């Protein structure tokens, strides 16, 4: 694989720890540095993230093993205390998706670069997964970026604008009620109805 | 020397440039591009064939991005006429632009509204009874009929 | 010698100049630009492809800056027709940006007004009861309709 040659070159700058096995698809690096490695390697290395750190049930066994490995990898992220990844296969074309359950630190929060990194990690770690199919999810809030469809884009714009108004009002209510009863003792959900019909009027 | 010969060379130059622009993306080995512009009033069309890296499959948004590249590279070419095809299947459907794909788009939009309302209900009602102790399914009926109205 | 050949060279010169203009920015590795101008009335279009530095992702204001560069570099090219795409996905929601511009503009303007009023209230009430002993949230309704009137 030619991409491996583009991956070993990045590492030789950082610290030069590696063990290149006979196979061209496998690379061995001490896990203590793999924790931080597989974040930059995600931004660089596409195929499967083959960085190993140190019949139906057959594929499920690795499937659970792969899910646990990705859960451990995402668990080591800074603003993440624990994480778990669920992988879905096409039962019977069917697009394969995946769900990533993550527990964050109370004080920290995820950023857009981190969202891109984690979604690309999950998509790359399993073959045949478009990154659009991967869905992040947390305990209380949901932090994702997927909002698009083949539908008329005007309707997509209307949906996103409605969501924006909803978010602004909910933020205002949360901010005003937060100092009284506490930081995490209130929730609010708002739904709105909007006008999208052209109108005119003339009075004499 | 002839105008036609110069136009032919221009088209080859554009095809090469567009291809070379396309391989710059990550998940693709290579691509080949063909164009068709009516010289003397039909919209121009284009066809793109992509040889794709095996371990990765492309997105819908990436389809939109490539279609936008091809559509904006040519003055008169609308994004509808772009056709992208991969080694296995064609990653675009325009056989009935005003028909079946429109109805499929309606289905996706309805599903989107359903998903948003279901998510709202789940999020609001989860903290009371528990994280995994509630499920919700929603169905909606939508309007797709053009209407006008006037009053005096 | 022919006019058409000279115009072809002109377009390449402009594309290269805009390229080296673009890589002068910090976060960008490289970029290539294609243009389309109708010779004989359709607005010209442009497409920009940018390969980006790995550790950085570019911002919305930077998107607007690049679009303004491309739009103002060409006389007849409106800012809408610019299309920008990155290595992975396209960083421009141009498809129906027309609908979703006025809406976000109204949202941000309303936010500005409410922020100003809240700042005034906080400033006036701060010295009396203490620095951190008061909070205020303000919501306002705005009129965005076009109206005229005549009286005789």
Q: Is A167 in CB contact (< 8 Å) with chain C?
A: no
- Residue of chain C nearest A131, judged by CA positions: C88
- Residue of chain A nearest B26, judged by CA positions: A46
Q: How far is B133 from chain C (nearest CA, A)?
A: 35
Inter-chain CB proximity A44 and C107 less than 8 Å: no
Angle at C22 between CA C17 and CA C27, to 5 degrees: 160
> Out of C2, C51, C89, whose CB is closest to B65?
C89
> Out of C5, C46, C95, whose CB is closest to B6?
C5
Give residues 73 to 92 of B whose Cβ lies within 8 Å of C.
Answer: 73-76
CB atoms within 10 A of CB A32: 11
The secondary structure of chain A, three-state, reads CHHHHHHHHHHHHHCCCCEECCCCCCEEECHHHHHHHHHHHHHHCCCCCCEEECCHHHHHHHHHHHHHHHHHHHHCCCCEEEEEEEECCCCCCCCCCEEEEEEECCCCCCCHHHHHHHHHHHHHHCCCCCCCCEEEECCCCCCCCCCCCCCCHHHHHHHHHHHHHHHHHHHHHHHHHHHHHCCCCCCCCCCCCCCCCCCCCCCC
Are B31 and A103 in contact by the 8 Å Cβ rule? The answer is no
Q: Is C65 in CB contact (< 8 Å) with chain B?
A: no
Dist CA B28 CA B15 (whole Å) = 17
Are C13 and C48 in contact by the 8 Å Cβ rule? The answer is no
User: In which residue are the tokens 């996905």 written?
Assistant: C89
User: Helix, strand, coil: what percent of chain B each, to 5?
Assistant: 45, 15, 40
- Residue of chain B nearest A186, judged by CA positions: B127
Pairing of strands A51-53, A27-29: parallel
Q: How far is B109 from chain A (nearest CA, A)?
A: 5
Dist CA A42 CA C120 (whole Å) = 48
- CA torsion sign for B141, B143, B145, B147 is positive
Give residues 66 to 95 of A whose Cβ lies within 8 Å of B.
Answer: none
User: In which residue are the tokens 């409106």 written?
Assistant: C78
Residue B98: both structure tokens together: 């005003």
Are A131 and A52 in contact by the 8 Å Cβ rule? The answer is no
How long, in residues, is chain C?
152
Inter-chain CB proximity B57 and A130 less than 8 Å: yes
Using DSSP's 3-state secondary structure scheme, residue B134 falls into: coil
Nearest CA among C36, C53, C54 for reference residue C45: C36
Angle at A74 between CA A72 and CA A79, to 5 degrees: 125
> Out of B108, B119, B120, whose CB is closest to A151?
B108
Nearest CA among A69, A62, A138, A64 for reference residue A99: A138
């Amino acid at each position: 694989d030619q991409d491996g040659g583009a991956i070993v070159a990045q590492l030789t700058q950082m610290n030069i720890p590696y063990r290149f096995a006979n196979g061209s698809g496998a690379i061995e690096v001490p896990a203590d540095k793999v924790h931080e490695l597989r974040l930059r390697l995600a931004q660089q290395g596409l195929p499967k993230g083959g960085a190993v750190g140190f019949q139906f049930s057959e594929q499920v066994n690795y499937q659970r093993a792969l899910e646990g490995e990705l859960a451990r990898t995402i668990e080591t992220l800074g603003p993440v205390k624990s994480a778990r990844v669920h992988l879905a296969m096409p039962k019977p074309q069917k697009s394969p998706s995946a769900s990533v359950t993550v527990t964050l630190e109370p004080g920290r929060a995820l950023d857009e670069g981190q969202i891109s990194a984690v979604v690309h990690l999950v998509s790359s770690a399993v073959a045949g997964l478009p990154p659009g199919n991967v869905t992040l999810v947390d305990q209380s809030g949901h932090l994702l970026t997927q909002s698009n469809t083949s539908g008329r884009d005007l309707n997509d714009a209307q949906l996103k604008f409605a969501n924006d108004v909803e978010s602004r009002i909910q933020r205002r209510i949360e901010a005003i009620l937060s100092p009284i009863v506490g930081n995490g003792n209130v929730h609010a959900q708002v739904t709105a109805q909007l006008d999208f019909a052209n109108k005119e009027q003339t009075e004499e | 020397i002839s105008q036609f010969s110069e136009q032919v060379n221009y088209q080859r130059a554009l095809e090469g440039e567009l291809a070379r622009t396309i391989e710059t993306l990550g998940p693709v080995k290579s691509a080949r591009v063909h164009l068709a512009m009516p010289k003397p009033q039909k919209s121009p069309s284009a066809s793109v064939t992509v040889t794709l890296e095996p371990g990765r499959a492309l997105d819908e948004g990436q389809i939109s991005a490539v279609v936008h590249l091809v559509s904006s590279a040519v003055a008169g070419l609308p994004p509808g006429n772009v056709t992208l095809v991969d080694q296995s299947g064609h990653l675009l459907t325009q056989s009935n632009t005003s028909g079946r794909d429109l109805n499929d788009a309606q289905l996706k939009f309805a599903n989107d509204v359903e998903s948003r309302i279901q998510r709202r209900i789940e999020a609001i009602l989860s903290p009371i009874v528990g994280n995994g102790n509630v499920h919700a399914q929603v169905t909606a009926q939508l309007d797709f009929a053009n209407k006008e109205q006037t009053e005096e």
